[PDB]
Structure formats: structure tokens, C-alpha cells
Amino acid sequence: VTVAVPKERAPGERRVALVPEVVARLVKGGARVRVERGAGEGAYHPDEAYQEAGAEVVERGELLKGAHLLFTVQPPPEDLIQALEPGAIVVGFVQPHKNLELVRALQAKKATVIAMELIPRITRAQSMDALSSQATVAGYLAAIHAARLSPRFFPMLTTAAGTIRPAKVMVMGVGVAGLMAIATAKRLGAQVFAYDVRKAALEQALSLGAKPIELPISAEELTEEEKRIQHEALRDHVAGMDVLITTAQVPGRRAPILLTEDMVERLKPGTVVVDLAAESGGNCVLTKPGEVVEVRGVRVYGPLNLPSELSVHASEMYAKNLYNLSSLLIEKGAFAPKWEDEIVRAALLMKEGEVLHGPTKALL
Amino acid sequence: HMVTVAVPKERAPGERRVALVPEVVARLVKGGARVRVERGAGEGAYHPDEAYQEAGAEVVERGELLKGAHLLFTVQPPPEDLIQALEPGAIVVGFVQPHKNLELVRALQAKKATVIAMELIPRITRAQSMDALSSQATVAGYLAAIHAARLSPRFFPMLTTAAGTIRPAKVMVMGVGVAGLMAIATAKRLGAQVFAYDVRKAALEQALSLGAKPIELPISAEELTEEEKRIQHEALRDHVAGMDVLITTAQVPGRRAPILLTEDMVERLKPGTVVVDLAAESGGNCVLTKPGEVVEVRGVRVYGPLNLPSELSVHASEMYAKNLYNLSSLLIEKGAFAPKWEDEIVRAALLMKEGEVLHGPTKALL
Numbered sequence: 001v002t003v004a005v006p007k008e009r010a011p012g013e014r015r016v017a018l019v020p021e022v023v024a025r026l027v028k029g030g031a032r033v034r035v036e037r038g039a040g041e042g043a044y045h046p047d048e049a050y051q052e053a054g055a056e057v058v059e060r061g062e063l064l065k066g067a068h069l070l071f072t073v074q075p076p077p078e079d080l081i082q083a084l085e086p087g088a089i090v091v092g093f094v095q096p097h098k099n100l101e102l103v104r105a106l107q108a109k110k111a112t113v114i115a116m117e118l119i120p121r122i123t124r125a126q127s128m129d130a131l132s133s134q135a136t137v138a139g140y141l142a143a144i145h146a147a148r149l150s151p152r153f154f155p156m157l158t159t160a161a162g163t164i165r166p167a168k169v170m171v172m173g174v175g176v177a178g179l180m181a182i183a184t185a186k187r188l189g190a191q192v193f194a195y196d197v198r199k200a201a202l203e204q205a206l207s208l209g210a211k212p213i214e215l216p217i218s219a220e221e222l223t224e225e226e227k228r229i230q231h232e233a234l235r236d237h238v239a240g241m242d243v244l245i246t247t248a249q250v251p252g253r254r255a256p257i258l259l260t261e262d263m264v265e266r267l268k269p270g271t272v273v274v275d276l277a278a279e280s281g282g283n284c285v286l287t288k289p290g291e292v293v294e295v296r297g298v299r300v301y302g303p304l305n306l307p308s309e310l311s312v313h314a315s316e317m318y319a320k321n322l323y324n325l326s327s328l329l330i331e332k333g334a335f336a337p338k339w340e341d342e343i344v345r346a347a348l349l350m351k352e353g354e355v356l357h358g359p360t361k362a363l364l
Numbered sequence: 365h366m367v368t369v370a371v372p373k374e375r376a377p378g379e380r381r382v383a384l385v386p387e388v389v390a391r392l393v394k395g396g397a398r399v400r401v402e403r404g405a406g407e408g409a410y411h412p413d414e415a416y417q418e419a420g421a422e423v424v425e426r427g428e429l430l431k432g433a434h435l436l437f438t439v440q441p442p443p444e445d446l447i448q449a450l451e452p453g454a455i456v457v458g459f460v461q462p463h464k465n466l467e468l469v470r471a472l473q474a475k476k477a478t479v480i481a482m483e484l485i486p487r488i489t490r491a492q493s494m495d496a497l498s499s500q501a502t503v504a505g506y507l508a509a510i511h512a513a514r515l516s517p518r519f520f521p522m523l524t525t526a527a528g529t530i531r532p533a534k535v536m537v538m539g540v541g542v543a544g545l546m547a548i549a550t551a552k553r554l555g556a557q558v559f560a561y562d563v564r565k566a567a568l569e570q571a572l573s574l575g576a577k578p579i580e581l582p583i584s585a586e587e588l589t590e591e592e593k594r595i596q597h598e599a600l601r602d603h604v605a606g607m608d609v610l611i612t613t614a615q616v617p618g619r620r621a622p623i624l625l626t627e628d629m630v631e632r633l634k635p636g637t638v639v640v641d642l643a644a645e646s647g648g649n650c651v652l653t654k655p656g657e658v659v660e661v662r663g664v665r666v667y668g669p670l671n672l673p674s675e676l677s678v679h680a681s682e683m684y685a686k687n688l689y690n691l692s693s694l695l696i697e698k699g700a701f702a703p704k705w706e707d708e709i710v711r712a713a714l715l716m717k718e719g720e721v722l723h724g725p726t727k728a729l730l
């Protein structure tokens with residue numbers, strides 16, 4: 001098997017689909033790897049370090065010559081698509097809704113793509129979950145940015161000039177990203193609170209030292225009347241916060257509004273919102289994606305591409321995810337795609353140009 | 365027969381701090397003092413006018429500000445419009461830094477003003493609660509570490525997921541005074557492996573206490589030969605090369621900052637390394653640093669922040685205000701203007717009286 005690795009082109013993308021250490025392991029297992037000149041520069045991995053790992057550092061669009069497996073972060077642009085070579089498998093993030101044009105080009109070229117956002121949440125696939133690994137990065141950076149943006153200390157502090165209270169941080173949406181925001185805001189010494197409609201998620205928060213927000217109806221269909229009492233109770237909680245980190249996203253849908261116009265009016269001047277849901281529209285009505293705005297003294301930040309900010313580790317984890325996915329793409333140095341495997345069945349978005357996952361057929 | 369204290373809006377570009385905050389203003393008032401605050405003075409620090417009025421002060425207009433009376437409390441030194449309006453016998457209290465504001469210092473003596481300079485508070489134990497250099501350095505240190513994390517392309521903490529385990533980042537703090545100690549405490553909380561470099565052993569002792577590993581050089585921490593300098597340098601250089609982040613904090617009053625990250629030292633940093641150079645305001649500890657900017661050479665991101673305190677404006681102002689409050693006990697008796705001129709703190713910090721410059725280096729520069 002020969003595995004190709006492109007230099008990412010999407011504006012502001014700094015990650016690389018494989019890193020040198022991972023490349024070595026693929027080589028030591030009998031695989032061959034070609035890496036575009038400069039592909040790991042965003043992640044501080046020089047061409048020489050790849051060569052050392054046994055890769056040949058080729059020129060772009062010489063890249064797909066050998067060509068059994070194309071490993072990307074973002075979906076491949078057209079220059080690469082055209083260069084595919086029949087029977088090749090594309091493996092990376094696809095995001096049909098964000099990159100429809102490139103998706104229609106992949107099927108027109110009759111290509112085969114395993115979509116990374118489509119890895120199933122089963123335990124056997126945990127080590128392959130790139131959404132999770134990238135969400136961890138995003139979570140960590142959410143918290144760091146919350147501290148950079150806030151005009152107060154996160155930790156409680158005593159000096160000869162007195163003592164200062166710790167900051168009050170609420171994380172809303174306690175999935176993988178939110179858990180790491182909790183872990184990181186807690187490390188910095190903030191009082192941290194957690195809001196999620198699911199009890200299991202809230203138990204995870206409690207475990208990391210976050211105080212769950214308890215609403216009049218408890219975590220696990222609801223009346224318009226019951227919604228109102230939840231809303232008013234959450235509103236009072238949010239008002240008392242020094243920082244809000246919102247992470248609630250729903251695949252192929254607009255993000256839910258969790259920070260409502262009337263909720264935002266009650267935030268004190270000097271509060272910070274780090275809205276991780278900006279990519280799909282934002283959990284907060286104030287948020288302008290990719291920007292930091294300030295209204296009524298409320299600093300609101302909607303980061304896109306946090307993973308690419310932490311490019312060294314984001315790439316390392318992602319590289320490992322792909323390597324771990326490889327055991328079902330590669331057998332004994334050979335190209336042996338386990339088509340019958342549930343992971344591959346769930347993640348295989350198209351085979352020879354035919355679209356195998358419903359919603360993607362609809363958009364096209 | 366009862367003292368009045370003025371507080372301006374800061375003008376210096378990018379200054380967001382306020383010399384007094386509302387909670388502090390109330391204590392001054394509740395002790396029988398009056399306070400006049402310029403409209404908007406606390407906005408940088410998210411303290412609305414109404415919070416000051418609530419605390420018992422009159423939110424007046426600028427340039428009406430000094431009419432009232434006796435004490436001008438500032439963060440940065442007062443610009444000219446304010447110096448011109450002083451009122452004889454009145455005291456200016458704040459940061460002065462003549463090397464940065466010579467012109468304004470010249471205007472202050474021309475107007476025969478009296479000024480207690482905040483950077484001149486003596487380092488004695490009784491003056492600890494009054495030390496604004498120290499309280500501001502704590503702010504600077506904390507943010508140094510936060511920015512180091514924002515800028516680094518790797519995790520600070522060691523981490524395990526189903527995708528593997530990741531080593532903690534390796535952070536060196538060079539210059540272990542007040543800012544350095546806070547950078548340590550904060551890089552530590554974030555789970556970095558933290559190392560500490562300082563020519564003084566007591567400072568290194570304070571680092572160890574916060575969980576930082578001291579950098580041990582061939583000649584040990586406390587008359588040094590050129591030969592002995594070479595081996596310290598080469599050893600430290602080996603240490604620096606192994607780091608993911610360098611935070612440098614070494615400053616010396618009224619001098620260029622010492623170069624602690626030499627050009628040969630910088631040459632050995634791997635691409636992806638971060639330098640937060642807290643000494644940019646006086647020239648930078650690192651040869652690469654461009655003050656107020658983030659540069660990237662040979663893949664090394666180097667940041668030289670000016671006015672970190674003003675980024676943390678809520679807490680910087682709070683500690684500063686308390687510092688000023690605490691200094692009051694020597695400026696104010698039972699609500700009346702009573703300067704204790706014979707106090708060591710006051711004599712150490714009194715930069716000028718009725719136009720007479722009473723602190724050498726400032727006389728010399730002027």
C-alpha cells in the first residue's frame with residue numbers, strides 16, 4: 001500500500017493528516033508514504049523529519065501517483081480530486097454541508113471516501129474518533145482564550161494587597177469539548193459550573209470538579225410552560241457568571257441558541273463568552289464567527305479552527321486516529337479495506353462514486 | 365478641614381486601568397474623605413459612573429476635576445491639561461517613570477508640584493500592602509503564562525485519551541521575581557513541567573516551593589570571570605534548547621533590560637517554541653523581540669507585551685486601588701489631609717516637593 005498526505009489548503013488550516021512519528025510506524029509495517037513538500041510546516045514538522053521516517057517528500061500532484069490511500073484533514077481540493085486514480089480511498093473530514101462543491105466533484109470522479117466525522121460512537125472505535133480528539137483540543141483552547149479575554153483572574157489569590165475571589169465559569173454543552181473546558185478552567189482555579197440536559201454528562205462534569213446547574217425539572221416531551229420555568233432558572237444562573245463557554249453543536253443543523261437575547265442583557269459588563277458553536281452559527285445571539293465583538297461590555301468570541309491553533313498536538317492525535325483506522329485499511333503492508341466492518345460501513349460515505357449515507361444524497 | 369481626592373480617566377494609549385475602584389472609594393468616603401472621579405474613569409475596568417456615585421463620590425467633568433482639592437490619584441502620570449490645573453500644595457500619587465515621561469515630569473516641576481512616585485515605594489515589610497510594582501507584576505506574570513499557552517501549538521498539561529498519551533509542555537521562567545513566581549504558579553496549575561532560572565538562591569528557593577525545578581548551573585546560585593561566564597552561558601543554552609516555552613521577566617529600573625536570550629541561544633530553539641518576553645517595555649530579554657508585537661522567526665513565536673495589567677483591568681485596578689488605599693493611612697488622618705513627610709515610605713517615594721526634585725537619577729536626567 002502507498003498512502004498520500006497533502007499540504008492542507010483551506011484558509012487558516014495548519015494541521016497535517018500524518019506526523020513523522022506516525023509515518024515511521026506505517027513504514028516499519030511495510031507501507032509506503034508520500035508527503036507533499038511542506039505539508040507539516042503548519043505543525044512544525046520539516047520535510048527532513050518525514051524523510052527520516054521513510055517517506056518520500058514529493059511535489060504536489062506528483063503526490064497521487066502511487067496512490068492507494070489519500071489521508072487528509074479537510075476534504076481534498078479539485079487539483080487533487082482529478083488526480084485520484086481509480087480504486088483509491090479518500091480518508092479525512094468531509095463535511096458535505098461546508099464543502100458541497102468538492103463533494104459533487106468526488107462523486108463525478110467516481111471516487112471512494114471514508115468520512116472522518118462519520119466514525120461511529122462505539123467503544124471499539126474510540127481510538128479512531130477524530131471528532132473527539134479535535135474536540136479535546138477545542139475545549140482546552142476555549143478555556144485558555146476565556147482567560148486571555150477576561151479582565152479578571154481565574155484563580156483565587158492572596159497578596160499583601162488583599163484576596164480576590166476565583167472567577168465563575170459556566171460550560172454549557174458538556175460533551176468532549178466541554179469536559180476539557182471544565183478540566184482546564186478548573187486547573188486554572190475557577191469555580192466551574194456545568195449545564196447539560198443529560199444526567200450522564202453532568203455526572204462526568206461532577207467528576208472533574210464542576211458544580212452541576214440544577215434546574216426545576218431534572219436531567220434525564222416538555223410543555224411550553226415547563227420550558228419557561230427552565231429558561232428563567234438558567235437565565236438567573238447565567239447572569240451570575242464571569243465567563244460562559246458554549247459548545248452545543250448538532251451534526252448538519254444550525255446550532256441551538258443557548259444564550260438568548262434576554263439572557264445576554266443580564267450579563268454584567270466585563271463578562272466573556274467563548275462560543276465554540278460558531279462554525280454552525282453559534283450558541284450565542286451576539287456571536288460574530290471568527291471575530292471578537294464587544295456589546296454592553298460583553299466580550300464575545302466565536303473561534304473557527306481552534307484545532308489548527310494547537311497544530312502540533314491536534315495533528316498528533318489526528319495522525320493517531322488515522323493510524324488506528326489503518327488496521328482496517330491495511331493488512332500486513334498491503335491494501336486490504338475491510339468493507340464488512342461496522343466502522344467502515346458507518347464511515348464509508350461513497351463507494352466508486354455512489355453515495356452510501358442518506359443526508360449527503362439529499363443535499364446533492 | 366476634611367480632604368478631597370481626585371481620580372482621572374487614563375489617557376495614555378491603551379491604558380484601561382483606574383487609580384481607584386468603587387469599593388475602595390466607599391471606604392475612603394465612609395472614613396470621612398471626599399472623592400471626585402472623572403466621568404468614565406472606570407469604564408476601562410467595567411466600573412460605571414453610577415457605581416462611584418453609589419460609593420459616595422461626585423462623578424464630575426474632566427478639568428473641573430482638580431478644583432475640589434488635595435490628592436491626585438493616578439495610574440500613569442497626569443498629562444498636561446491636569447498638571448496645569450493642580451492647585452498649589454496638592455499631591456500627585458501614581459506611577460511616574462521619568463524615563464518614559466520626561467516631558468510630563470519637566471512640566472510637573474515647572475508647575476512646582478508635589479508627587480509621590482509609585483515605583484519608588486521602598487521594599488520594606490511594612491510597605492508590602494502599598495507595593496504597586498509587585499501587585500502589577502502578579503497580574504503581568506499570570507497573563508504571561510496564559511499568553512504562553514494561547515501561543516504554544518502544544519498542550520501544556522500531560523493528557524491521555526483513547527488516541528494516546530501526550531507529554532506535558534516544558535516551560536522555563538527566567539527572572540524569578542514577583543512576575544516570574546506568578547508565571548510559575550500559573551504554568552504549574554496548567555500542568556506544565558516548569559523550570560526556573562535566577563542568579564539568586566532565595567528566589568530559586570521560592571520557585572521550588574511552588575513546584576518548579578531550579579535550573580542548576582556549574583557555578584552555583586548566591587566577582588565572576590570571563591571564563592566562568594562562558595561555562596554558565598553554554599550550560600544555560602543547553603537548558604533553553606530543551607524548552608517548549610520561555611517566559612522572561614528580568615528588568616532593572618532605569619536601564620536597558622539584560623539579554624537573557626542571546627542570538628546563539630535563539631538559534632538552538634526548535635520551531636514551535638514560544639517566548640513571552642515581559643521585559644519588552646525596557647528593551648526585551650530576547651534579541652528577537654519586537655515590543656507590542658508577535659513575531660515569528662525560524663518558527664519561534666516571540667511576543668513582547670506592553671501593558672499586561674491593563675488587559676486584566678478589573679483586578680489590576682482593584683489591587684492598585686487597594687495599594688493606594690493602603691498608602692492613604694500615611695496621607696490622611698480622620699478624613700483630613702495630613703501628609704506624614706517624616707515617614708521612611710514617604711521620604712523614599714516623595715519624588716518632588718513644591719517643584720524641588722528630591723530623587724537623584726531624576727535630577728540627573730532632567
